Amino acid sequence: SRRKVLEEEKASDWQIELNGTLFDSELQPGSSFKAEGFRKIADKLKINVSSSRDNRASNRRFQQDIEAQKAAILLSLNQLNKRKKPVMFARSAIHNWGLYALDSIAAKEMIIEYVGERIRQPVAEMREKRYLKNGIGSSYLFRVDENTVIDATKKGGIARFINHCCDPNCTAKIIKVGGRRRIVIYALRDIAASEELTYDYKFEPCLCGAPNCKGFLN
Amino acid sequence: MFQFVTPVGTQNGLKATCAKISPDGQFLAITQGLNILIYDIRTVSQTLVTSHARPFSELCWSPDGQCIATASDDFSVEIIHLSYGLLHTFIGHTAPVISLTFNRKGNLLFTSSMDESIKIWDTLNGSLMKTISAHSEAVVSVDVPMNDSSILSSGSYDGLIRIFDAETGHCLKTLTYDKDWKRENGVVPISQVKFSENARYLLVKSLDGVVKIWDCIGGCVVRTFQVQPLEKGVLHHSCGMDFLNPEDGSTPLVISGYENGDIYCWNSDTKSLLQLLDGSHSSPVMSIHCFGNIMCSLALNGDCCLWR
Amino acid sequence: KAKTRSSRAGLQFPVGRVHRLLRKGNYAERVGAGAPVYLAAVLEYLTAEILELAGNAARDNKKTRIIPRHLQLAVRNDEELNKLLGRVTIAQGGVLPNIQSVLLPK
Amino acid sequence: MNILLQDPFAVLKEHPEKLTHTIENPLRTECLQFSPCGDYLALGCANGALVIYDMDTFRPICVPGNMLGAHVRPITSIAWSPDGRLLLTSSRDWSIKLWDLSKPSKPLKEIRFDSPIWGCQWLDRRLCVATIFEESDAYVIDFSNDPVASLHGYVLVCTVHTKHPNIIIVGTSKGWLDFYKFHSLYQTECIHSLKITSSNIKHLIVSQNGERLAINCSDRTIRQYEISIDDENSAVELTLEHKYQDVINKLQWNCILFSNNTAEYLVASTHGSSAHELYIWETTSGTLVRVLEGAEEELIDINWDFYSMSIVSNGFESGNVYVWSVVIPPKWSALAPDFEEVEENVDYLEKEDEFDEVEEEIAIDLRTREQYDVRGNNLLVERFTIPTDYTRIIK
Amino acid sequence: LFKKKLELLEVYLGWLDNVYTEMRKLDDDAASHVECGKEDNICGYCSTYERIPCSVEEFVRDFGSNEEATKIHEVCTKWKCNRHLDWVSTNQEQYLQQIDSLESMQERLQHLIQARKKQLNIQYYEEIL
Amino acid sequence: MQIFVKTLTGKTITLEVEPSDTIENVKAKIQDKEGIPPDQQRLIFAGKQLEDGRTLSDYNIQKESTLHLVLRLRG
Ligand SMILES: C[S@@+](CC[C@H](N)C(=O)[O-])C[C@H]1O[C@@H](n2cnc3c(N)ncnc32)[C@H](O)[C@@H]1O
Numbered sequence A: 001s002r003r004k005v006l007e008e009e010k011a012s013d014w015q016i017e018l019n020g021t022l023f024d025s026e027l028q029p030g031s032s033f034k035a036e037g038f039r040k041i042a043d044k045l046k047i048n049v050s051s052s053r054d055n056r057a058s059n060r061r062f063q064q065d066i067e068a069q070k071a072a073i074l075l076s077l078n079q080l081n082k083r084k085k086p087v088m089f090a091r092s093a094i095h096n097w098g099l100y101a102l103d104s105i106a107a108k109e110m111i112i113e114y115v116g117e118r119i120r121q122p123v124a125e126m127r128e129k130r131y132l133k134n135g136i137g138s139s140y141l142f143r144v145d146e147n148t149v150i151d152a153t154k155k156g157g158i159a160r161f162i163n164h165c166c167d168p169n170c171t172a173k174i175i176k177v178g179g180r181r182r183i184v185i186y187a188l189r190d191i192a193a194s195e196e197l198t199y200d201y202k203f204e205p206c207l208c209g210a211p212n213c214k215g216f217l218n
Numbered sequence B: 001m002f003q004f005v006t007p008v009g010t011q012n013g014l015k016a017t018c019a020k021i022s023p024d025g026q027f028l029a030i031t032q033g034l035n036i037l038i039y040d041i042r043t044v045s046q047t048l049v050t051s052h053a054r055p056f057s058e059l060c061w062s063p064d065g066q067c068i069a070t071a072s073d074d075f076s077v078e079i080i081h082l083s084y085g086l087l088h089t090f091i092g093h094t095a096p097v098i099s100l101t102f103n104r105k106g107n108l109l110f111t112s113s114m115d116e117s118i119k120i121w122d123t124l125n126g127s128l129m130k131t132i133s134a135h136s137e138a139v140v141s142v143d144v145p146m147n148d149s150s151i152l153s154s155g156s157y158d159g160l161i162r163i164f165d166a167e168t169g170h171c172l173k174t175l176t177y178d179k180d181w182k183r184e185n186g187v188v189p190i191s192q193v194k195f196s197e198n199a200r201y202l203l204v205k206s207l208d209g210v211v212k213i214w215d216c217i218g219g220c221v222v223r224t225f226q227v228q229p230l231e232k233g234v235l236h237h238s239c240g241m242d243f244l245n246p247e248d249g250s251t252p253l254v255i256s257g258y259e260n261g262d263i264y265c266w267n268s269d270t271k272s273l274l275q276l277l278d279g280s281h282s283s284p285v286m287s288i289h290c291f292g293n294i295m296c297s298l299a300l301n302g303d304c305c306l307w308r
Numbered sequence C: 001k002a003k004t005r006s007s008r009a010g011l012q013f014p015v016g017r018v019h020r021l022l023r024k025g026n027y028a029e030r031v032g033a034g035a036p037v038y039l040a041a042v043l044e045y046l047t048a049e050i051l052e053l054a055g056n057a058a059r060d061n062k063k064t065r066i067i068p069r070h071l072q073l074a075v076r077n078d079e080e081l082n083k084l085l086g087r088v089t090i091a092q093g094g095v096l097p098n099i100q101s102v103l104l105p106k
Numbered sequence D: 001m002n003i004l005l006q007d008p009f010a011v012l013k014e015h016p017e018k019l020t021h022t023i024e025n026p027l028r029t030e031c032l033q034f035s036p037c038g039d040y041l042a043l044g045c046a047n048g049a050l051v052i053y054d055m056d057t058f059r060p061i062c063v064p065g066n067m068l069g070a071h072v073r074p075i076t077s078i079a080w081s082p083d084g085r086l087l088l089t090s091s092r093d094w095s096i097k098l099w100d101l102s103k104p105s106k107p108l109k110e111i112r113f114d115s116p117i118w119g120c121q122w123l124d125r126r127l128c129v130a131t132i133f134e135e136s137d138a139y140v141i142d143f144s145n146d147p148v149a150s151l152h153g154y155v156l157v158c159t160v161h162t163k164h165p166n167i168i169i170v171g172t173s174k175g176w177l178d179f180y181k182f183h184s185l186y187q188t189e190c191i192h193s194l195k196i197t198s199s200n201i202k203h204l205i206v207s208q209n210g211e212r213l214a215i216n217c218s219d220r221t222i223r224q225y226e227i228s229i230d231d232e233n234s235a236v237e238l239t240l241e242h243k244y245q246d247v248i249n250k251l252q253w254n255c256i257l258f259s260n261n262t263a264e265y266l267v268a269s270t271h272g273s274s275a276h277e278l279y280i281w282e283t284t285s286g287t288l289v290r291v292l293e294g295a296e297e298e299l300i301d302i303n304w305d306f307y308s309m310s311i312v313s314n315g316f317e318s319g320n321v322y323v324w325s326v327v328i329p330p331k332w333s334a335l336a337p338d339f340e341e342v343e344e345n346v347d348y349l350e351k352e353d354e355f356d357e358v359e360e361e362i363a364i365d366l367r368t369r370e371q372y373d374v375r376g377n378n379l380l381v382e383r384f385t386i387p388t389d390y391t392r393i394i395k
Numbered sequence E: 001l002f003k004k005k006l007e008l009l010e011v012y013l014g015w016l017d018n019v020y021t022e023m024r025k026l027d028d029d030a031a032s033h034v035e036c037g038k039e040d041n042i043c044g045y046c047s048t049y050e051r052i053p054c055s056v057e058e059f060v061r062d063f064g065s066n067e068e069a070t071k072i073h074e075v076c077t078k079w080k081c082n083r084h085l086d087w088v089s090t091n092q093e094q095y096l097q098q099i100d101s102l103e104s105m106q107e108r109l110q111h112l113i114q115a116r117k118k119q120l121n122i123q124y125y126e127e128i129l
Numbered sequence F: 001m002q003i004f005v006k007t008l009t010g011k012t013i014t015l016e017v018e019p020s021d022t023i024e025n026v027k028a029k030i031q032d033k034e035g036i037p038p039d040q041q042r043l044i045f046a047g048k049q050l051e052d053g054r055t056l057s058d059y060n061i062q063k064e065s066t067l068h069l070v071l072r073l074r075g
């Protein structure tokens, strides 16, 4: 029975010291997972491609391939704002989801268009009311002009994954292409890689997280 | 109907978490706090000592019956060779890891944590491969199919049943809504998920005793099994469920063990209940693991049994 | 029926014209039959690559007419189109906004 | 599966478009060969080292011959077995070594010759066909007990027909195609011969359905024919379909390859200096459609995998192995059951209702499997798994 | 069970290693006969170490101008021919890395015995209790 | 009844068809609405390519279904 005590003390002490060394965290509490443990605590203690020339050349080649195919036909045109930077969506701090730049981008450059379904104002009011009804409570509406709004709650681009921040690094302008107004997002100041794309909502609580910041999105 | 054989399990000691048959229908790997019992089938037992610092939640065999992985709340996961001792220590998580599984080839291992994420580890080189953070809740179960090895389902304590890929780890389809896209009090945590034998339909159990079969191509439920009284449907632990495709079986069966020592059998095609077992009533059945025509059941105690 | 030589290659720039210019510009005694095609392809590639940036500039400036200032911007803002045109001066192109850092107030 | 769920726009591209990974081999690579399915990559290194990488990790999984019997000098051919178990290789060490991948420590069988080897090819049974350096006849080695038998300049490349495994094709060092009928065990009479060029044939590839054939001459051209066989393996003819070449700088070709079944695409690797790219033509019309532009060095060998749909090619100066694969981007549209993403502002039409507020028994088969995927690759084929060796893991 | 498992280690140490070292050592005299005949030009080819025959009476004169291509003790080469690589040069290297692989698994497999024993000591520590 | 045909380019067309129509009739309908010859297209539904000879009802297609139209593009 010597083995019991000997290997017990040796392995136990070594393993707890190894865990202590591997534990750069605060040694949070927790039992096993056969105990019905939900631990639904509010605050979590754990964490939380080539060039532009290649892209434009490939895009023009694809578009001229379409135009060469067009001799058989309309139903094939493309959203002209294809000059968009590479981004991605992942878990964020300011909110659950967010948009991170995949490559370092300069300043005063187009990033992405905010696209969705076009609706009038009363339709937008009805829709936001119904969304507040079903517990959505997360407005994705955008104001093109006085009598037209974009709605990206169910249909739209990844531009619906850009959070409001008290200090933005991207702004939103309203271009008119083909005679119609569209919402583009420009890089206000230079943006490094793997940086979250901040942007000011101007809505007229705030999980801002900025150094200088105000407690309201409004 | 399925007859009983023998309750060989050792009901003495700490509580056991699960017991998964070997992929050749020959061994039974049972767990106790910081140790592994191995029962032959033959009537004999062997023991393996681990290198954890806490009791571990789940263990699963290897498709060649030569290794055993274990998921300990010390935030690490240990793969131990059944004959040459411990082999690899995956130490990248930052939260108690819950479930584990690897693919048909034993080429990559899948780990679910409380970090609100999943991790794809490389078994042979012991290094990490990928990380999939697609939950704001407790990721309690991951499972790759056996005939396929390209997709993996993921269930959490918020109802989100996601499907990802083993090759690149992107989100392919989500069959349910989280708190933000449904009435908040409509949520129901997912306990245990399981693929069909052909990876075309998804078996799932929630924390209200319901057992659903989703058509993952259409994303719609097609079959729902339930106990018409709601006594133990409402549950609190990972009350085991599993599938039983009998050798030359007409239609495979679904098996579940509620917070009693009860075990049910439903014909998936007809939903008509066929048989139930109890105790053979003493404690919540913590796990069930089936095989070609056999089944091992383990209650919250050391209570262990098998059938045929 | 006839079939323009610049349409058999998917080009817009003229190939018969480029071929006549190569022939009657006294560059060599003989001109290969595929040299004008290659040269016209390269010419239209370069002009499209600069017109695209010029249009991007004229759009990001809320106009809808490419204008010499937009070509100057499209060139001097690039990095390789700037070496190809390092010696030229684009009439009515102005200059690029730039102020040194020793001069900006503190 | 993982493809049925994917959208059939970015998954049904016709060929790779970008390079993703670049394996680095410590030795210099000389031959590439996927497993019958896109599972393993059997590389033959510079000094007879033979590794088997796995496509899920890109890191080695088994080095055959670690105990003994390994190869010592540049390897020249690696042929898998249709199941996945056996693996034939041949090097410049004159030896042909067949390995049972269930015991990869030592070679299962091996034979030795009197000259370096160009290539070995499988037939089932167990019998390979080999082409020896400088010789003018192929060799049939039906080595279940190690016997060897024999069967216009020389013979460089051999290949067996896909639909009719009795037919055999061979190219000469003087421009002759010669066909053979394996109507027996070790006695084979020709059925057709001809001479299409005045230079050496260097490659003989054939589509999976015997409805096409390609040839790489020492002349800087590629001759593509539409072969057909009939008459109890006697009727055989060739019809010139196309000739490909480099119109700008007349470069030479290093290796060629087809698509999967109908061979709607032809992939070739150029050989001259300043040549770093792969060409991809059609075969019906023959017009250039793509140029793979990833590497920075002369590319020797090519291999296509239709399950994962990836092109693999080994560099010459360095020795690396570049991979061009189809890339599918992550769609946020999946994050919910009804999240349909658009590209342009869609208009909205509304019914008069919207302003005014206010058993199942479907067929279910769980034990039946699916035979073909979206692309059209045959599942359910036996996919033998290389057994992991634990001895080299403890250290 | 285990003595069967890693007594092949002793097999792998002794038997195949002595056979392969003897086959490697034969190439010394098989090279020496051709070397002494060649030094008295044509590249002495391979194919003469099989049983290491070198079937010859007087190699300095049996190679003599009368017959050039080794009618007896037949080497592949007739002259300075690049047909073969004349593997007689550096042939040992094959066997050399052969026995190098021998020794490599030897050291590895000895380490494996120690690991098995490290586990089985704890085995009888658990079986005593 | 209406079915949908989603083109890669971002366009979805809402064809009107009957379940008793053949797929050949569907390709003809896509042509006569959009002018694309039936030979140059390629229709996909639920991961399976719709086979040239069979019928719409063979695939259990009902109204307001969506399906993908990819082009067998060429030079
Ligand atoms: C464009 S959506 C942002 C996307 C969101 N993270 C998601 O997961 O879909 C904007 C909405 O997210 C929430 N949100 C965004 N930024 C926020 C912030 N800084 N503080 C609080 N809520 C925020 C609000 O409900 C707001 O109406």
Ligand SMILES: [Zn+2]
Pocket: A165, A166, A206, A207, A208, A209, A210, A213, A214, A215, A216
């Ligand atoms: Zn704020």
